[PDB]
RNA sequence: GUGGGAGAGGGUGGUGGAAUUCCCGGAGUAGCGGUGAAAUGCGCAGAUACCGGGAGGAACGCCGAUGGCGAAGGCAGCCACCUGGUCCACCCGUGACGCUGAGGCGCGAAAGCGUGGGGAGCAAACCGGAUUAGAUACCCGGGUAGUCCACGCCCUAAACGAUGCGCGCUAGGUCUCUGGGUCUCCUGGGGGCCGAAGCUAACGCGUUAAGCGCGCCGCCUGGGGAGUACGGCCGCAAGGC
């Protein structure tokens, strides 16, 4: 049981329906792999520094979660199945390291 | 890995008395836990040698401690082996 | 015959030759020149003067399509790079900007022995 | 000798391990997409070593460029 | 033991962008390439240069260093999982349980070998072009094994600090990585430089000793013949000891 952070970048062109469906599958797969959600930050569409999947922008999701370590990899795989999901990055959470303090 | 609760479980299990973290029995026990963990890690990942060195060093340490116990108090030695189930 | 009137100028420079490709804003080429297009044949293509002649030639060929303002793109490290630049600067063409696009790998491929003591 | 400014002294209170914050990290990148040296950043060994990893993390997400085109010249 | 720390230490899976080559499309024309100078070569079946899309293989730019880790070989994009080593603080626990280590066992760059796969770039052999008195070379155009992956062999090296391991003692100055602390500074571990005493044939070494000592292992005994011959062991072979 460790605390991670899930970054997901998906298609910015999504209408509210398809978007809702993608997030539904995200929550679904999450509960399937047993990840408790501590909080969520939806940053929406932002302008990428380089083209990803030929599209100049992307829609962002950030989930701070806690899940059994053993299945984390096995989770990420699933999250990459959907065509609409172009980026997945899972990071072990870390205490913030301040500079110039 | 090896969580603190497991460590305390085995320590309290093999402790000669309350508060004893350092006795030969405790050390051999802890080492044995580590050794088993590592070997089960090495049934897969058999191509990882750097860790296998670690396994060698731990094994050696355990053998030396057990030898010491064997010298001082053969009763506690046989007891230790019996509870741990070493020597094969 | 298009009448583009604004476009890009690519400069490919190496210690051997310098060649200039003038394109529309989409990157599709219009005309081009080089040290070989001018009467130079051998090593003389690496000349700064060669590069000047080339740049000027491509520019004059671009006047024929009636072009005025261009963007310059520099690739390669070789002689006569800045000479081709200066050439284009006033050819009668207006130079809107200069950029060095020279591709540098993140070290993918093993260089030839000539270029080695690197990766 | 980079006597213009040190990126640290030109900045306020901030978190180095945060890969999602662009408007700060961008200051640590050159005219090109390259990570600045200790001379320019004015960071320390530990700090710089963390900064690198967070920058790369941001790059992969698409928040920061791997490389850029050089203006002027 | 408890609590903290740093790290390219190792194994498995996944993944990101730059570049090269090939393919597809657009646009576009007489050459590109390469050298001291050239030629072979490629190009009117449209090459070079430019934009767009795709496939594949290999290596990870900046960070990056005189830096870090590892017993050595060696280790560098990013993420996750498994896992080794190590340092500091507290003075908690055991109570000499230690050091070394013939033989044994395991690890061991590159090249090389076996089976299967893969093959973008590079490239022994080889095919050409030049140079040259010749050129079985340097330079140029190609190119097979190989380089890459899995499994199994091989056991070498300028495998280098040309400095076996451990412990104790013997001025300091300075730079640096990483902890702790009354945080000008003190204290501890690691990496560098200059230097006290001392040592050394000299160069140099000098708290990271090549100084002063103790323990244990390995090794040397003039050069060539020769790391050859014979024997033995090991190896599919090359060959190794
Ligand atoms: N090679 C793993 C690396 O682990 C890093 O993180 C490593 C360190 O930060 C961390 O240190 C741990 C920690 O609990 C704390 N600092 C003290 C502890 N003794 C350490 O654990 C250590 O000892 C144990 C055996 O006892 C080993 O199993 C383990 O590998 C080692 N890190 O343990 C981690 C695993 O070794 C980073 N993720 C990255 O550099 C990389 O993935
Ligand atoms: N970066 C992946 C690495 O893969 C290693 O092992 C992987 C690679 O060594 C090996 O090569 C695979 C190849 O099988 C497969 N047919 C194609 C694939 N593109 C390759 O993967 C890798 O190839 C090389 C490294 O050799 C890299 O240059 C490349 O970026 C990477 N994609 O395939 C293995 C997995 O099947 C280790 N797990 C670890 O170093 C790391 O995760
Ligand atoms: K010709
Ligand atoms: K070093
Ligand atoms: K002297
Ligand atoms: Mg997908
Ligand atoms: Mg030992
Ligand atoms: Mg030429
Ligand atoms: Mg690592
Ligand atoms: Mg590509
Ligand atoms: Mg074509
Ligand atoms: Mg050719
Ligand atoms: Mg060819
Ligand atoms: Mg022809
Ligand atoms: Mg021909
Ligand atoms: Mg024709
Ligand atoms: Mg054809
Ligand atoms: Mg091409
Ligand atoms: Mg392309
Ligand atoms: Mg292919
Ligand atoms: Mg560097
Ligand atoms: Mg070292
Ligand atoms: Mg070395
Ligand atoms: Mg005490
Ligand atoms: Mg007592
Ligand atoms: Mg030993
Ligand atoms: Mg031995
Ligand atoms: Mg070997
Ligand atoms: Mg090899
Ligand atoms: Mg082979
Ligand atoms: Mg084969
Ligand atoms: Mg070649
Ligand atoms: Mg060749
Ligand atoms: Mg030849
Ligand atoms: Mg001669
Ligand atoms: Mg063969
Ligand atoms: Mg050396
Ligand atoms: Mg050394
Ligand atoms: Mg040294
Ligand atoms: Mg000698
Ligand atoms: Mg020494
Ligand atoms: Mg020895
Ligand atoms: Mg020891
Ligand atoms: Mg020191
Ligand atoms: Mg070192
Ligand atoms: Mg000195
Ligand atoms: Mg003296
Ligand atoms: Mg002297
Ligand atoms: Mg000493
Ligand atoms: Mg000998
Ligand atoms: Mg003799
Ligand atoms: Mg001899
Ligand atoms: Mg020999
Ligand atoms: Mg004999
Ligand atoms: Mg014999
Ligand atoms: Mg035989
Ligand atoms: Mg032979």
Q: Which domain holds residue C42?
A: 1-119
Residue-range domain boundaries for chain D: 1-73
R_g (Cα) of chain D, nearest Å: 12
Task: Render D10-42 in DSSP notation, one character per residue.
Answer: T--SEETT-SS-HHHHGGGB-SSSPBPPHHHH-
Length of chain C, in residues: 119
Give the CATH number for residue C18: 3.30.420.80
- Best CATH choice for the domain A1-101 from the list 1.10.3720.10, 3.30.70.60, 3.40.920.10, 3.40.50.880: 3.30.70.60
Ligand 36: distance of its center to the CA of C108 in Å? 27
Q: Which method, experimentally, gave rise to this model?
A: X-ray
Structure tokens at C66: 């009636």
Task: Render B41-82 in DSSP notation, one character per residue.
Answer: HHHS-TT-HHHHHHHHHHHHHHHHHHHHHHHH-HHHHHHHHH
- By the 10 Å C-beta count (0-12 exposed, 13-18 middle, 19+ buried), D46 is classed as exposed
Query: What's the domain count of chain C?
Result: 1
What is the bridge-based pairing of β-strands C94-100 and C69-75? parallel
Smallest CA–C1' separation from A90, nucleotide: E79
> Which residues of chain C are within 8 Å of residue D69 when distances are taken between CB atoms?
99-101
Rounded CA separation B34/A40 (Å): 39
Cα distance from C81 to chain D (closest Cα, Å)? 11
Closest residue to E178 (CA to C1') is D46
Kindly list the distances between the CA atom of residue C103 and the CA atoms of C75, C81, D68, in Å, as whole numbers in the listed order.
Answer: 7, 15, 11
CA-based torsion, B3, B7, B10, B12: positive or negative: negative
Write down the CATH number for the domain with range D1-73.
4.10.640.10
Rounded CA separation A45/A8 (Å): 12
> Which helix (H) or strand (E) segment is C12 a member of?
strand C6-13
Chains in contact with chain A (at least 3 beta-carbon pairs closer than 8 A):
D
Do the beta carbons of residue B11 and residue B30 sit within 8 Å?
A: yes
Rounded CA separation B2/A96 (Å): 26
Task: Write A24-31 long-range contacts (CB < 8 A, 24+).
Answer: A25/A82, A26/A61, A26/A79, A29/A75, A29/A78, A29/A79, A30/A63, A30/A65, A30/A75
- What's D67's DSSP letter? -
- By the 10 Å C-beta count (0-12 exposed, 13-18 middle, 19+ buried), C3 is classed as exposed
**Reduced to 3 states, what is the DSSP secondary structure of residue C35?**
coil
Residue A98 CA to E92 C1' — how many Å?
Answer: 35
Which domains does chain B show, CATH number per domain?
A: 1-88 (1.10.287.10)
């Amino acid at each position: 049981m460790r605390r991670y952070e899930v970054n997901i970048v998906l298609n910015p062109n999504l209408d509210q329906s398809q978007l809702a469906l993608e997030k539904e599958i995200i929550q679904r797969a999450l509960e399937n792999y047993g990840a408790r959600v501590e909080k969520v930050e939806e940053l929406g569409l932002r302008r990428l520094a380089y083209p990803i999947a030929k599209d100049p922008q992307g829609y962002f999701l950030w989930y701070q979660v806690e899940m059994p370590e053993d299945r984390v990899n096995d989770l990420a795989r699933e999250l990459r199945i959907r065509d609409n999901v172009r980026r997945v990055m899972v990071v072990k959470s870390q205490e913030p390291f301040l500079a110039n303090a | 890995p090896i969580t603190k609760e497991e460590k305390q479980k085995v320590i309290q299990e093999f402790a000669r008395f309350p508060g004893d973290t350092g006795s030969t029995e405790v050390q051999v026990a802890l080492l044995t836990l580590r050794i088993n963990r590592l070997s089960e890690h090495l049934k897969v990942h058999k191509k990882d040698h750097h860790s296998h060195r670690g396994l060698l060093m731990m094994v050696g340490q355990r053998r030396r401690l057990l030898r010491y116990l064997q010298r001082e108090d053969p009763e506690r030695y046989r007891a230790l082996i019996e509870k741990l189930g070493i020597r094969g | 015959k298009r009448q583009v009137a604004s476009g890009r100028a690519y400069i490919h420079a190496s210690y051997n030759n310098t060649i200039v490709t003038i394109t529309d804003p989409d990157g599709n080429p219009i005309t081009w020149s080089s040290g070989g297009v001018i009467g130079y044949k051998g090593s003389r293509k690496g000349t700064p003067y060669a590069a000047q002649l080339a740049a000027l030639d491509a520019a004059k060929k671009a006047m024929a399509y009636g072009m005025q303002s261009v963007d310059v793109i520099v690739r390669g490290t070789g002689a006569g790079r800045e000479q081709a630049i200066r050439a284009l600067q006033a050819s009668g063409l207006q130079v809107k900007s200069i950029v060095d696009d020279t591709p540098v790998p993140h070290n993918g491929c093993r260089p030839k022995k000539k270029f080695r003591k690197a990766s | 000798p980079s006597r213009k400014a040190k990126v640290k002294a030109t900045l306020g209170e901030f978190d180095l391990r945060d890969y999602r914050n662009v408007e700060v990290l961008k200051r640590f990148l050159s005219e090109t997409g390259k990570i600045l040296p200790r001379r320019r950043t004015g960071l320390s060994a530990k700090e710089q070593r963390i900064l690198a990893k967070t920058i790369k993390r941001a790059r992969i997400l698409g928040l920061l460029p791997f490389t850029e085109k050089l203006v002027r010249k």
